[PDB]
């Protein structure tokens, strides 16, 4: 036993010197020798379980050697973890860190890896593990780790209609058992601050500002979109996605407009006004092809969701803004439609989404309005706000 685990110990450390290169031939033989290494072992485990993170402690402690690359140390750890079925159940800090990378140019991007293609294993599955784990370990480090994600993820873009698609195969998520886990942890301030100095890890990856929006802070997502403002400045594509994520959110938003508290509904509040402020400060800048007659509908749903549980005649804003962020998104479709790409796709799609737009609001102020105007002296109207709810509505 103990002589086998030596020559275990020196298996790694030959591994860890050859190992020092990774160009074209200095990483797949010695993948063939793990293969044989797992075809050995397969024919009281406290012990191993610390023999084996002492070995991870020896040969990852070099890189708290020509091994730099800190995004391949994280592969081969993790696969000597996972495959073996040895899993590690320490700091994942430390092999988190490790696959955070900090590439800054696209083609710099992509070299700082290049063997991931080369090497056709099921990497996904011990990154949907890790993930996992990530849950379990109640730590946000994974952030930096869903880059690599992105690597080995079916790296494919949408058809244009995002609305359709479910949020798992919208934020590159698929598979992972997707938010079960930021339930009651308000203390989401940490993991905040963690993305606030990563706006470099955002100039990076495009998905993942999109996934960043699809975790879950409910009562935090009004922060997080105005926190990386500069980086929505750096890149005008990302607002429209924003909307998306809102839409994915729409039962949600129902159950807090089912609460009808004050702070509750006020956090929608200033969620659609910062919304509103992003997309008609950025109306220039976003990309022609980025727009689709697809995000009509979600805003059209968005709409009909808020004005269907805003019972309440104090809450008019909710409903107004709602209209505002719709005829903001019509207007910009306005220059798809009739400027430049010229399709049947407009005009028909859009009536539909005014109509179904201007009849929520009809329905809400038929819901509201339920007594006279006029309050049987014919002096004082009988509701406080309604001339003010009809001047803030009619003129959206």
């Known amino acids: 036993v103990k002589g086998k685990q030596i020559a275990a110990a ?33 024919q009281r485990e406290k012990e191993v379980k610390r023999y084996l993170w002492q070995h991870l402690k020896k040969h990852v402690v070099p890189l708290p050697c020509p091994v730099r690359s800190k995004l391949k140390t994280g592969l081969i750890v993790l696969f000597v973890v996972e495959k073996i ?3 590690l159940e320490g700091s ?3 092999l988190c860190h490790l696959l955070t990378s900090d590439a800054s140019s696209p083609d710099e991007f992509h070299r700082d890896l290049s063997h991931i293609l080369g090497i056709p294993q099921s990497w996904r599955l011990y990154l949907v593990n890790l993930c996992q784990r990530c849950m379990d370990t109640r730590t946000y480090t994974w952030l930096g780790a869903l880059p690599v994600l992105h690597c080995c993820m079916e790296l494919a873009p949408r058809h244009k209609d995002a609305w359709r698609q479910p949020e798992d195969t919208w934020a590159a998520l698929e598979g992972l058992s997707f938010s079960p886990f930021r339930e009651q942890m308000l203390d989401t301030s940490s ?9 470099h890890l955002l100039s990076i990856d495009e998905p993942l500002f999109r996934s960043w929006f699809s975790l879950l802070p409910l009562s935090h997502l009004v922060m997080y979109m105005e926190n990386f403002i ?30 009808q508290d004050v702070q509750d509904v006020q956090n929608v509040q200033n969620i659609l006004e910062m919304l509103l402020r992003l997309l008609d400060t950025y109306r220039d800048k976003i ?15 968005l709409h009909e969701a808020i004005c269907s549980s805003t019972k309440l005649l104090k809450f008019y804003e909710l409903p107004a803004l709602s209209a505002e962020i719709v005829c903001r998104m019509i207007r910009l479709l306005s ?32 819901e509201v309005f339920t007594k006279n105007m006029l309050t049987s002296s014919g002096a004082s109207f ?12 009619v003129e959206i």
């Open 335 to 366: 220059l798809v439609d009739s400027a430049g790409q010229r399709d049947e796709t407009g005009n028909n799609s859009v009536q539909t989404v005014f109509q179904g737009t201007l009849a929520a609001t009809k329905r809400w102020l038929r």
């Open 10 to 42: 020196l298996m790694l450390d030959s591994t860890f010197s050859i190992l020092q290169t990774w160009d074209t031939i200095n990483l797949n033989s010695f993948f063939t020798q793990f293969e044989q290494f797992c075809f050995v072992l397969q």
């Open 191 to 199: 993991l905040l601050q963690f993305m606030r100095e990563k706006q």
């Open 92 to 94: 994942l800090d430390w």
């Open 287 to 301: 990309p022609e092809e980025a727009l689709s007659p697809s995000y009509l509908t979600v805003c059209l749903k």
């Open 230 to 259: 500069e980086h929505l400045g750096r890149f005008p594509a990302h607002i429209l996605d924003c909307l998306s994520g809102i839409y994915y959110r729409l039962p949600g938003l129902e159950q807090v407009l089912n609460t």
């Open 382 to 393: 009988t509701y406080v706000k309604e001339i003010e709810v009809w001047r803030r509505l």
């Open 85 to 87: 079925e040895l899993l």
